[PDB]
Amino acid sequence: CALQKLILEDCGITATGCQSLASALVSNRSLTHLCLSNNSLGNEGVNLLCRSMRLPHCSLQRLMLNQCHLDTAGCGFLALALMGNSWLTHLSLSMNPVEDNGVKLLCEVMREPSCHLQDLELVKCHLTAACCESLSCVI
Amino acid sequence: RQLDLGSSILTERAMKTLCAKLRHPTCKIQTLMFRNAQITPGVQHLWRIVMANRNLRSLNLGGTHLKEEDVRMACEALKHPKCLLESLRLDCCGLTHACYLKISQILTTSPSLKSLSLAGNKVTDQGVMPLSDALRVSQCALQKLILEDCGITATGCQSLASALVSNRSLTHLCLSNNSLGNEGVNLLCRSMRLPHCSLQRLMLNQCHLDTAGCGFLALALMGNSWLTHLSLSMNPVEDNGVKLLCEVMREPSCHLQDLELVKCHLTAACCESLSCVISRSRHLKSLDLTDNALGDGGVAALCEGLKQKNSVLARLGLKACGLTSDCCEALSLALSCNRHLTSLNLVQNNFSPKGMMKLCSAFACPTSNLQIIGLWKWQYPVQIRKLLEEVQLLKPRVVIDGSWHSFDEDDRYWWKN
Amino acid sequence: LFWDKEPWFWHDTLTEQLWRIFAGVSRFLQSISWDPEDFEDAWKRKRLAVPCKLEKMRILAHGELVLATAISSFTRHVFTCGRRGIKVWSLTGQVAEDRFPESHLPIQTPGAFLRTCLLSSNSRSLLTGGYNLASVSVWDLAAPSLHVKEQLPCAGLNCQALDANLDANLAFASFTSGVVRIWDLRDQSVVRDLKGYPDGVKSIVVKGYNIWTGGPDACLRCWDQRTIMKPLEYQFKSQIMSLSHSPQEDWVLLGMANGQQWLQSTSGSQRHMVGQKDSVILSVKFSPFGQWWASVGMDDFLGVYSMPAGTKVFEVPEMSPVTCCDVSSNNRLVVTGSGEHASVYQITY
Amino acid sequence: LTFSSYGLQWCLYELDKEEFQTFKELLKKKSSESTTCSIPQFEIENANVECLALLLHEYYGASLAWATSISIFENMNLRTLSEKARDDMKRHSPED
């Protein structure tokens, strides 16, 4: 396989699709972009992607998850995976009911030197002043 | 060796006379206890013996009232080079800031004292900072510390974080019934992420934790191999927090052995995760799940976990989980299959007579070797009582006592208090 | 006693051996402990803890069916009630089983019985009444000799439940003719009278300015002394056997004679299940500190339950059906009565 | 004088050690807020149950001491002992 980009908008995939795609991702070493928009993957799908990305040979650079009904739990999973990995460079979690706590977790993982995240766009995450203070320290 | 006073109204002359006969070097008593007694007028007399006698090892006070002069006398008595006292316990003495300062100074100066407990004292962050400053120095010889109902806040948490990163001697720490919250959990976690930390047991009960605190602790748990015990009881840590901890603990590098959590609002999903952990992990040796509505699905999941021959789980704790007949049948089958489980516990449940028959039959199998079982005999009809007595006749080593915490090691409950 | 293969004391062995020699031919049961210091129960690792233990410590033989039981703790006695009279026991001595009461209280009148009894919360008075009787009598327990001090007149009426309230000096009664009366111990003159329900009210409980009653019709009603307004009716599915009101909070606990228990709150009409059993409940009693309640039924079992949610801690078996129970004020002792015997248990936590 | 104090001591001898300390603290707070009659703090701290009841009667007064103790009992969430105290006061306090 020689794929570099893949757009799957409004496909309505489930956790089983998460497992299939994540195993395929782990086996493969050519993919670099992946967009999974408007799908109710949920925190369990986030967990399967987290595990499949925990390996140090993973070399995908960009992934996005818009309108997946996320919460603080999936944010904790993403924070856990992100640590110790320096290849994934772009991410996004938009229009999700993440709270102050999820942003604090992401800041805590990202605040260390070893993190290589470069872009992060978030819209409508019910933020407040505390998130601003944490992001100020991170910046 | 051991002397105690279950209750008493001692006169000053009485305590003077008692202490007079204990300053003699021929005495050999190791421990003491005065927690329930009322000995306030003669407490000052207690210090001369600890200064003089050499074989005294422990000293327990409690509920008494201590004045500044008394604490100064305690400091001076501890400051004698000849003392070998290796434990102290002050409780509800209602100390003052200067008292904490003096205690910190003696801690940094006294080499013998290897423990200290302050439960019920009003020790605000202004009482936490001097102790942390004493801990920072490299001579401190403390190894345990208890702080109950002190009501510390985030500032105390960051003071302790700095002390811990600086310090390299302390091993046991208990901060229970304090309103730390997610911020304090995060501060301690940050201090603990370093590879040179040397803490082995920490417990945080009634700390107002939540999902976020569990996420922070799980995050700081990865990349550590010294901490061996943990306990987060009576906090509304939902299924998701336990799921995060299980995800962290599923790795082969973790060295966590004991984990207890009570009254956490658990369900079947956490049970699926924990069954996975038990089947896979190779260092977990204990577990507790009380007052949780685990139900038939949860017990079935844990049973599918313990059926495996690889598991090395030693003791399991079930109680007030709302069980029934089918789940007891499944548990009996699992206990028939397993060979490493030794301890167990089942109380505050509703077993039907058929279920109890199943459980006794399973306990009968030669393969299983359970050295403790938690059940009430008299709560059943005569048929069941004679059946359980018959089971007791085979394997005379088996013990069936409803009140658990029997044959449990002394350290587990002596450390906490 | 019966539960063990044989009950034995420490001096029993020596006495038996000496007797055998003279004629030429745990294991050791314990006695109750009264002082509070000697309990010496360590903190789990005046109180609101939920109990976690039981053990029988005596049996009381009455000789005939037992209808009502009461236990005083300020004084150690116990009171049993039967169709022909009342017997007063004691708990101070140490014996496996008792046969010699402390006093007998007989009634001589053709076709005269007793059916109910009730003790005052101060342990100073004892209401007694029954069928075809002249009046409801009150006994003066504080005096150096039992004797009736007052009489409450009633003609051609049978009393099936009693109650009292010592703060305002009010004594209550319920009769099989669906009539609930009142009195005053200062003058002994009927103050009011509530009627209109021929089915009647089997149980009545008094607290403050309300009077809750229930009967076979499967309804609970509330009356207020100050006014003469009509009662507030609640609808249930089965009959009601007994009631008890929490001393701490606002709840009313009852048994529905179909193995169900429900809680009712005065402020608003709220209910929820707190237990289920295959038998029929015949009594329910509330602890002095409102953290747990006991329930004695017909399927030879004594149960203890937890107030916050209704989960059951444990239960004990018996041989004969039970019909009464009573929890001491210390919160330690619980008495029960079945068949022709009245046994005593102890609670340790 | 002694007759009522006897019942009061018997009321305060059902109190546990921690309950006794809490009662002493509440009484100290009440006294400090009070300016009509002042009670030394060291005497309160050094006194036992019998001395506590006798002094509470001595400074405050029979009926007033009973009322204060009943109120504090209610504050500590001790209902039953309060009712016992009220009844024993009804039976011990002479008519006035």
UniProtKB/Swiss-Prot annotation, chain A:
Domain of life of the native organism: Eukaryota
Location in or out of the cell: Cytoplasm; Cytoplasmic vesicle, Secretory vesicle, Cortical granule; Mitochondrion; Nucleus, Nucleolus
LRR repeats: from-to residues: 28-51, 57-80, 85-112, 114-137
Tissue: Expressed in cumulus cells (at protein level). Highly abundant in oocytes and early embryos, however poorly expressed in somatic tissues such as the liver and spinal cord.
Modified how: Phosphorylated by PRKCE.
S-S pairs: none
Subunit structure comment from the entry: Component of the subcortical maternal complex (SCMC), at least composed of NLRP5, KHDC3, OOEP, and TLE6 isoform 1. Within the complex, interacts with OOEP, KHDC3L and TLE6. The SCMC may facilitate translocation of its components between the nuclear and cytoplasmic compartments. As part of the SCMC interacts with the SCMC-associated protein ZBED3. As part of the SCMC interacts with the SCMC-associated protein CFL1/Cofilin-1. Interacts with PRKCE. Interacts with TUBB3 at cytoskeleton microtubules.
Record: disease: Oocyte/zygote/embryo maturation arrest 19: An autosomal recessive female infertility disorder characterized by reduced fertilization rate, oocyte maturation arrest at germinal vesicle stage, and early embryonic arrest. NLRP5 variants have been found in a spectrum of phenotypes characterized by aberrant methylation of multiple imprinted loci, a condition known as multi-locus imprinting defect or multi-locus imprinting disturbance (MLID). MLID-related phenotype spectrum ranges from intrauterine death to different types of imprinting disorders, including Beckwith-Wiedemann syndrome (BWS), Silver-Russell syndrome (SRS), and non-specific developmental and behavioral manifestations. MLID has also been observed in individuals without overt clinical manifestations.
Family stated for the protein in its record: Belongs to the NLRP family.
Purpose of the protein: Component of the subcortical maternal complex (SCMC), a multiprotein complex that plays a key role in early embryonic development. The SCMC complex is a structural constituent of cytoplasmic lattices, which consist in fibrous structures found in the cytoplasm of oocytes and preimplantation embryos. They are required to store maternal proteins critical for embryonic development, such as proteins that control epigenetic reprogramming of the preimplantation embryo, and prevent their degradation or activation.
Name of the protein in its database record: NACHT, LRR and PYD domains-containing protein 5
Record gene name: NLRP5
Swiss-Prot record, chain C:
MF terms (GO), sorted A to Z: structural constituent of cytoplasmic lattice; transcription corepressor activity
The organism's place on the tree of life at top rank: Eukaryota
Entry-annotated residues carrying Phosphoserine: S287
Subunit note: Homodimers. Component of the subcortical maternal complex (SCMC), at least composed of NLRP5, KHDC3, OOEP, and TLE6. Within the complex, interacts with NLRP5, KHDC3 and OOEP. The SCMC may facilitate translocation of its components between the nuclear and cytoplasmic compartments. As part of the SCMC interacts with the SCMC-associated protein ZBED3. As part of the SCMC interacts with the SCMC-associated protein NLRP4F. As part of the SCMC interacts with the SCMC-associated protein CFL1/Cofilin-1. Interacts with FOXG1/BF-1; the interaction inhibits TLE1 interaction with FOXG1/BF-1.
Disease with which this protein is associated in UniProt: Oocyte/zygote/embryo maturation arrest 15: A rare cause of female primary infertility. In affected women, ovulation proceeds normally and the retrieved oocytes appear normal, but zygote formation and division are severely impaired. Inheritance is autosomal recessive.
Designated name of the protein: Transducin-like enhancer protein 6
Record's function text: Component of the subcortical maternal complex (SCMC), a multiprotein complex that plays a key role in early embryonic development. The SCMC complex is a structural constituent of cytoplasmic lattices, which consist in fibrous structures found in the cytoplasm of oocytes and preimplantation embryos. They are required to store maternal proteins critical for embryonic development, such as proteins that control epigenetic reprogramming of the preimplantation embryo, and prevent their degradation or activation.
Organism: Homo sapiens
Location of this chain's protein in the cell: Cytoplasm; Nucleus
Cellular component GO terms held in the UniProt record: cell cortex; cytoplasm; cytoplasmic lattice; nucleus; protein-containing complex; sperm midpiece; subcortical maternal complex; transcription regulator complex
Intervals holding WD repeats: 61-99, 109-149, 154-193, 196-233, 235-274, 276-315, 317-348
Protein family (similarity comment): Belongs to the WD repeat Groucho/TLE family.
Domain characteristics, as noted in the entry: Contrary to other WD repeat Groucho/TLE family members, does not contain any identifiable Q, GP, CcN or SP domains. Only the C-terminal WD-repeat domain is conserved.
An individual GO BP term: negative regulation of canonical Wnt signaling pathway
Residues of the full protein shown: 146 to 572 of 572
Keywords on record: Cytoplasm, Disease variant, Nucleus, Phosphoprotein, Repeat, Transcription, Transcription regulation, WD repeat
